[PDB]
Design a protein that fits this description.
The structure is cut from a larger assembly and holds chains A and B. By secondary structure, chain A is an all-alpha fold. Chain A is about 55% helix and about 0% strand. Chain A has helices spanning about 5-30, 40-55. The longest helix of chain B has 19 residues, at about 55-75. By secondary structure, chain B is mostly helical. Helix content of chain B is about 45%, strand content about 0%. The chains are: A mainly alpha, B mainly alpha. The interface of A and B includes residues 47, 48, 54, 64 and 69 of A. The structure holds cardiolipin and 1,2-Distearoyl-sn-glycerophosphoethanolamine. 1,2-Distearoyl-sn-glycerophosphoethanolamine binds near residues 11 and 15 of chain A.
């Protein structure tokens, strides 16, 4: 009956679920377990490049806190 | 023209605030509260001199007062601050609004152990006044002497001497 349309809808739903979950896991993987930094504005880009400099390992996502200062 | 004068590399050595942008953003309100005076002396010197070479030492005072700002966090409230800037650091836009309970723990421990009150909505954007001893720059643009203006019109307006003087027209 009407539940015969649900396997195709479920397959199409998995195909629509793959890009979002994929880009979420890839952005968590490539950014040190966290969200990708959003730099729409030049202040955000300046802070992100300053993070890349102060990390010392050429990665913006490697965070340095109070342990880095004496 | 001339040689542009630059300070030496020893004149630029200061101990850097080597912390991340989420670390700076986490403590930024208490930083603007407690490190007001050297930061504003520096930014006054920076908008008035219009020259960063004349703004090194005040800048060093900024980098002197920021580090003492973080040491005073590290001696007292290292763990709630760390729990707070980690939560700031997770967000891609670095939302303050996702991190209110860690903010509350950090603000509680800072008000208890250091007595610092966090600035309210509208305080760190105030135009404040700065009492320095350095003199006012009399020519910050290094402008030379302006050309003298043309002489203005004076004297009462007389009629035209014998009119237009155009070939034979007597008026
Ligand atoms: C107390 C308060 C009250 C007091 C009241 C006192 C007055 C009471 C009376 C009231 C009426 C006053 C009339 C005006 C003042 C006198 C004007 C005068 O005689 O000027 C002499 C003027 C120069 O003589 P002046 O000895 O040096 O001056 C004596 C005065 O002191 C003249 O004064 P100025 O020395 O200061 O002159 C200034 C200067 C003197 O001029 C100059 O310095 C040289 C430059 C002049 C222009 C040259 C242009 C040339 C190329 C174009 C030619 C066009 C074609 C010719 C005309 C074809 C037909 C239109 O004028 C100009 O440059 C302006 C241009 C000329 C205008 C003249 C007046 C025209 C009014 C009537 C128009 C009708 C047609 C007239 C002829 C048009 C052609 C001019 O003569 C000419 O230039 C030759 C033209 C003839 C003069 C016009 C006479 C006006 C009356 C005409 C009646 C008949 C009409 C017939 C039907 C229409 C024609 C088909
Ligand atoms: C994001 C999600 C995307 C999902 C996409 C896919 C959705 C559909 C998934 C498959 C659904 C079941 C398909 C079954 C097909 C029929 C199988 C079968 O029994 O075929 C029989 C045929 C002949 O058999 P025979 O041995 O000759 O029989 C004589 C018996 N005495 O034997 C044959 O024809 C040979 C065997 C053919 C098997 C084909 C199976 C389907 C292949 C589809 C390609 C995509 C598969 C999934 C990819 C993603 C996952 C890895």
């Amino acid at each position: 009956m009407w539940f015969e349309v649900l396997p195709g809808i479920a397959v199409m739903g998995v195909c629509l679920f793959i890009p979002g979950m994929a880009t979420a896991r890839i952005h968590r993987f490539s950014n040190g377990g966290r969200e990708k930094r959003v730099a729409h504005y030049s202040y955000q880009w300046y802070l992100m490049e300053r993070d890349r400099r102060v990390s010392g390992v050429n990665r913006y996502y490697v965070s340095k806190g109070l342990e880095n200062i004496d | 023209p001339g040689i542009v004068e630059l300070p030496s590399l020893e004149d630029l050595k200061v101990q850097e605030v080597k912390v991340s942008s989420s670390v700076l953003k986490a403590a930024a309100h208490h930083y603007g509260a407690q490190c007001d005076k050297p930061n504003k002396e520096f930014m006054l010197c920076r908008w008035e001199e219009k020259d960063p070479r004349r703004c090194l030492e005040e800048g060093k005072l900024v980098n002197q007062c920021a580090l003492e700002f973080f040491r005073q966090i590290k001696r007292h409230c290292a763990e709630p601050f760390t729990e707070y800037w980690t939560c700031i650091d997770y967000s891609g836009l670095q939302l303050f609004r996702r991190c209110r309970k860690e903010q509350a723990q950090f603000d509680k421990c800072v008000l208890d152990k250091l007595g610092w009150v966090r600035p309210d909505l509208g305080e760190l954007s105030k135009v404040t006044k700065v009492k320095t001893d350095r003199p006012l720059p009399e020519n910050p643009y290094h402008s030379r002497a302006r050309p003298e203006p043309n002489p203005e019109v004076e004297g009462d307006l007389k009629p035209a001497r014998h009119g237009s003087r155009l070939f034979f027209w007597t008026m």
